[PDB]
Every structure is written in C-alpha cells, then in structure tokens.
Amino acid sequence: MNLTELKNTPVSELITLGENMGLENLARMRKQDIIFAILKQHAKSGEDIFGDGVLEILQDGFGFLRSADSSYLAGPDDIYVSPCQIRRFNLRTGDTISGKIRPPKEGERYFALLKVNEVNFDKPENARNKILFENLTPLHANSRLRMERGNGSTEDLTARVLDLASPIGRGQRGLIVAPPKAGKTMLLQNIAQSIAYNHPDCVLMVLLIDERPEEVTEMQRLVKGEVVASTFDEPASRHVQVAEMVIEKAKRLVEHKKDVIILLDSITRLARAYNTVVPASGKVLTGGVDANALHRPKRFFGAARNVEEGGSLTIIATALIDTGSKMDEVIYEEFKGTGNMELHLSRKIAEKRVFPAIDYNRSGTRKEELLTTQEELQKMWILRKIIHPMGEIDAMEFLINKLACTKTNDDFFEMMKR
Amino acid sequence: MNLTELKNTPVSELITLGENMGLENLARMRKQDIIFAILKQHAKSGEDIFGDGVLEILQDGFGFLRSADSSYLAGPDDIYVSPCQIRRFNLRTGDTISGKIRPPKEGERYFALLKVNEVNFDKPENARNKILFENLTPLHANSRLRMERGNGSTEDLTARVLDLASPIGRGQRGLIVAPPKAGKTMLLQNIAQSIAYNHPDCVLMVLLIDERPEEVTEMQRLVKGEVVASTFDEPASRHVQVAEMVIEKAKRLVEHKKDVIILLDSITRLARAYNTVVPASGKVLTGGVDANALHRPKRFFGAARNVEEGGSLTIIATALIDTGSKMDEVIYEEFKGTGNMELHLSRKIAEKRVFPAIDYNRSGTRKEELLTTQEELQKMWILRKIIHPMGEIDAMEFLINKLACTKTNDDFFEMMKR
Ligand SMILES: O=C1C=CC(=O)N1CCN1C(=O)C=CC1=O
Ligand SMILES: [Mg+2]
C-alpha cells in the first residue's frame, strides 16, 4: 500500500507480513530483497501501492527513485522512471517524486512510477515554474540561527559557547577544524539537537562519510531529521554518490524557498574519496593529492549560500587536521580561506576532560554584524578583549564556569558587565 | 566411523586404520588422500558414515564442506553438496553442516551429503528463521570482556595491563599497532588464553595470515579453540580464501545469538594479499597499493559489531608498522581512524626487555564508559593523569612493578588510591 511505510518497518515485522501471503525463506535475504518480494505480493492482488524517493538521473537518461532510508543505496526495490517521464515534467537529480507504483512487466526488473503526484512537496506543473539554483544571486548571511536551547542544561552549555564563539546564520558556509580525539562527533550531535529544536521549520540533513557502522546508528537514533551516511567499508564510489545525491536534493529545496541545513562529517574524508574516484590529471600535488580532484569537493563546499530571492543553504563541514597524514594536511590547506566561518578545537583541552574543546582565540566568522544586533556584538567584543590575553586551555575553564551560573547568554552578558 | 574424528586422528594411526582393511602403501601420500582412501574402505562395506564441515559455495552453484582441521584446504575428502540441496534448506557460505555422507557413485569423484542433520548446531528447518547479518542493527560495545585472569601468575600481568590500558568489550573492533620484534605473538597467545578461560561460551577463532609454518603449530597447541592459518608459502589466493571463510563462518554464528571472537594476525598481511589478488582498477596509490584493493579487507575489518538483537563479533587485528616497507605504512594509514580501540606496542620498551611492551600513552579505547563501571572509570582516569607526563619506557616499567605487588587490578587501585 505504502512503500515508504514498508521500508521503515523493522525486518522482523517484514517476515511476518511476508508469511501472510505465503512467502517462505525470506529471513535469509537482504532487507531490500524482502521489500521487493513483498511488493510482488500486492502486485498479484492488484491493490494500489504508493511510494516515493529521491530521483537519481543516470548518464543514459533513465533514472531511479533512491530511498533516503537506505542511504540512497542502489537496491532492487528502487522505483524506475522512464526517460520519457522526466521530459513531460521537468525533473533532474534530487527531485522528490511521490506517486503510485506499477508492478514491473516482463523484462522489467524494477518497479515503475505510473503517475507523478507531488514533486518536492508540490504539484508537477508548479515545480516547472521554479528558477534554477545556480541562476540565483547569493547574499550574505543575515538571519541568526539561535543555537541555544534555553533550558540551561549541561548539553546546552556547549551551544552557548558556540553562539559566543562564532555566530552561525542561514546560508553561512561554516567549517570546523577538528584534531583527532577532540569530541568532534559529540559537538555535531549537539548542533543537530539544537537546530531541530529551536528551528523545526528548516530541513536538517546529516551526511557522514567514512564513518564507523556503530556511529551511524547512534546518529540515526539521536538526530531528529534525515540522517544519511556511508560506512568506511563501502567503496570510494559510494562515498561520492551518497554525497552528490545529498547536495542535489538540498538544492531543490532551495529552489522551492526552504531553509536547508547540512551537517557534514567530514570534508577531509569526502575529498580523499574524490581523489580516488576521478582519473589522474597528470599534474599531481604533494602527498599524492590530485590538484584537479580538489575541484569537485570545492563545488560541494561552494554551494552553500543565502539566496536573496528566498531560502538559504547551510553547510557545516568538519576538517580533520593533525591526523598524522600528509594528504589530510593538503586537503585542509585548500579549504583554508574558503570557509565563511571557522571553529577550532584544541586537543590539549580535550586531554583536560573539558568540553566543549573550543579554541575561542582562533575561531569566528566575518560579517558577524549582519547576524547579531548592535548591542550583542559590542558585548561579545568585550569578551574578545578578555579571552585574547588569556591562554587557550584556561580560557575555556574560565568561560565554562561563568556560563554555568547563568542560564542564558544575555544573563551572562549582565554578569561580566558588572 | 566419524569423518571429523578421522581428521583429528594423527596420520600414524591412520596408517594403522588403513592397514586393518588391507590398504597398501598409504604412508607415501598426503593425509587428505589417506582419509579419502580410508573412507572408500567403508564405502564398499556399506556401513553408515558420519561427518561435518563448513560450506563454500562456488559461483557455479555447488559447494563443499571444508574442514577447519585442514585450514579449509581444498582437500579431496571435501563433501559435495548439490545445487538443489542448498535450495531445499536456505544455505549459504559459512554454514556449518553435519550429516551422513553417501559414497561417490560412478562419474563422481567427491563424497556427497545425503541427509542434512544439523545446520549451525541447530535443526535444518529452524536455520531459515534467522535474520541475515547485515540486516541486523549494529551498536556500541557495552559488555566488557574480563581479560584479567585473577590468579596472580607471571603471564597475568600481560592481561592485567591490557584491561587497564584499553578495555575491550564484545563486538569491539580493535586494532593492535605492532612494530616488528615487539613481542606481538606473545601478546596474542596471552589474550587467547584469558578469553578461553574467562569466557568459555564465546566462539574463539584465531586466524593467522602469511605466518611461518613454525608459529602455526605453536598456536594450535596453546589456543583452546579454532586456530586456522595460512603459511607464507601458500599463494596469495589462499590468504583471502582462508580469510573470507572465517568471517563468513563468524557471521553465521552471530545470527544464532552467539558471541564470536576473531584474533587476526595480521591485517597488514591480509591487505597485501588482497592487493595481489584483485585486478588493477587504473588508480594506484603511493607505495604500490591499489586504491580499490583496500575495499575488500575493510569489509572484513568492518564486520565487527555488537548486534542489538543478540550476540556480537569481536575482531582484534594486528597492524604492522615500522617494517621499512612503504606498502605496510600505507595500509596502516587507511585503517588509522577505523578501529573502535587501539593498542600501541612500542619497540623501545621491547628492547629494554620489559614485557608486555605497551605504549600506555598512545593506547586507549572509545566509549569506555559503556564497558567499565562508573567508579572503575574514575580510577582509570586517575591513573592516566599519573602516566601522562611519564615517558613510554619508564611508565610501563613503573606500571609493571606496581601491578606485581597486588593480586588483582581493583586491589592495585586501593594501593595507588592513597
Ligand atoms: O540439476 C540439479 C541441481 C541440483 C541437483 O541435484 N540437480 C539434479 C541432479 N540429479 C539428477 O539429474 C538426477 C538425480 C540427481 O540428483
Ligand atoms: Mg604496546
């Protein structure tokens, strides 16, 4: 009946549903193959079935509707779309298409979409009246994203430091400099919790590249939104396919004037995947890094903007430095001046078991006056004149206790003032 | 009478068993052919025969029940299974099949399985009610494996130190960084004894890749469990075949809610074996390592998890560094930020005749609060502050003498408490 309702069902329940018609030996199959077999159970009965996904356009012209639940993995249950269908309605990669599914005919190994009902949460004819993303004019970030929960909890303390260190606004292309063993993945989970709580309206997407399988399920059970990731055992091809799909899908929501926020982890691991995928260009930089390969991740990082016409696109990527790898150092150098916002983590503060390990003296964002107010910026500048003489390690020790007593940042602004 | 009881019988007794019927000149051939000749002796007698094995499905469709007593070598006494026999029961590679074997007929050079009695130590009909491996949801390790023996023996200090430095739980994807001549194999033998003593329930499998034939028989006489190895004289195809057959056999036991532990030695030798077998993809990394070659071993190393439904899969693979080869260093770079826990062996401590030579500063685990108790973790962090300023050689020397005074680790904590 509802394909998207079937995918989110646990595999144990899929066995019982398969046994209802009379299917057998389903327990020794993949999760996707069970859905494909179950979709045939409704095919014989002729009952109407609904399913959606994210369109991926192949080089030949015929595409598929990848599922966001399976992290856009090419499975047998992917809905097929004919090349003629993408011409009647102007569609490209990343378009969210929902409609009825017809059973495959003879010679068809994939289910096909019979009628297009909604495209990007809009009518098919309405979606063709939207201006393309690259034709839009970028504008500076001016809508502040309030990262503070306001409950004064221990986890909210990290957000208060983040707000005080570097303000982040809609469309701001941030970047996090993360040395290894510094609580980087703990910081990202705090951001996703605050974003989905303070601003439920904006679409939140979390993209993890080369992440441990035990880390993917921790993020999926924690982030209130859409979490898509590719484990390290997957090939380098799957690292860029799962990345291009996310940015293409994110662009479409901008064309419909929706605020979209992407949390990336990590840009360094994404770039190395591109270096493997692309053919050698002859001219190779130091450390085995292909200088031509860096263009593709720069396109991914350069897509973040605040569109004047409406909406925005926020990318908060994490950079891995001090990892003991020559290639990881080369990647970070290319994205040095590119990031609109920079946040630095201190390894030494992590060894003090002090969280968040925020290097306040070497973090911040340009054009912060467009985000904050006049009085807010001046109060922050007072702390900038206070923390700067102090060292990095003791600054967080001093800053954490000061922010602990006050529940809110403005309350703290009334503390150090007097 | 029993094929598995025939294999473990020494070849001297097999000659006596062969001479009882009247078989002539059996001494001048391999032990595999002697078993095959003895089996044909009972073929004409007509008495029922018994045996078991581990499946290995070829691309053609048929399989063989290789035996772990011969390190899954393609012996002439491997039981053949029909392509439809793996269809009536939903079978796949790595399934442990036991049952009566019928003698080969005319045109058949291999023994054939006549009746499937037990699959994975379970009824052949209940084996198809188990969910596949990858469909299981991975999770963080939260059940600590008590590596401490507690008897106060001299070799117990090796395990007692390891529990102090890097706690290991069920499903903990570990990684041991071992330079050459640092007592690596002495550490593995100590682990395989404490695990087989403290936790008899978990399936302890030890896999040695590219190891000397001398060390194989040393491990087989010490480890109380399955010890399967491939010597260096074996081709590169045997290293990957003997490694795929081990992870697949471990995956099946996970589906039956059984904890399985794999002690790999070493992930570097395994990766180099895969680099030889797989074809060139056109992109070559530094040091001669193919880019897509490392995808296969990462899947082997990435299968370790603590399945939420039940059971686990613990892989402890050794990494070889400082071997003077650029290929060995490249492999370690890819598996750097991959394992759940790391344990660094130090050459300098080994040259001081200090055992175990463990680099306490650079060794540690992740999410250790899940394994250890609240108060135990506090004591460990107290120890970290003491060790942190000390060097590698002195701290291990300081730790060893302190641990020798007390019988148990917690008793040692009291001595250093005040
Ligand atoms: O074609 C397949 C695939 C598995 C399988 O057993 N067979 C048939 C083999 N087979 C005969 O043709 C007559 C007796 C018998 O066992
Ligand atoms: Mg060591």
Residue numbers in the entry:
A (entry chain K), B (entry chain J): 1 to 418
Manuscript excerpt for this entry:
Bacterial RNA helicase ρ is a genome sentinel that terminates the synthesis of damaged and junk RNAs that are not translated by the ribosome. Here, we show that stress-associated nucleotides ADP and (p)ppGpp bind to the nucleotide-binding site in the CTD to trigger the formation of inactive ρ aggregates.
To test whether ρ forms filaments as revealed by the structures, we designed “sensor” Cys residues that would be closely spaced in filaments and used bismaleimidoethane (BMOE), a high-efficiency short-length (8.0 Å) cell-permeable sulfhydryl-to-sulfhydryl crosslinker, to assess filament formation. By contrast, (p)ppGpp induces the formation of transient ρ dodecamers. Our crosslinking shows that ADP, but not (p)ppGpp, promotes the formation of extended ρ filaments and our structures suggest that ADP-filaments may be more stable than ppGpp-induced dodecamers. To corroborate this idea, we obtained a structure of ρX1 that was BMOE-crosslinked in the presence of ppGpp. Our results demonstrate that, in the presence of (p)ppGpp, the majority of ρ forms transient “non-extendable” dodecamers that cannot give rise to filaments and co-exist with a minor fraction of the filament-competent state. The alternative C-to-N filament and N-to-N constellations might explain the two bands representing dodecamers observed after BMOE crosslinking. Residue substitutions in the linker that connects ρ domains or binding of stress-associated nucleotides to the nearby ATPase site trigger the formation of dodecamers and higher-order polymers. ρ hexamers can form dynamic N-to-N dimers and long C-to-N filaments, which can be visualized by crosslinking in the presence of (p)ppGpp and ADP, respectively. Formation of stable (for cryoEM analyses) N-to-N dimers required prior crosslinking, and long ρ filaments could be directly observed on EM grids only if additionally stabilized by the C-terminal H8 extension and linker substitutions.
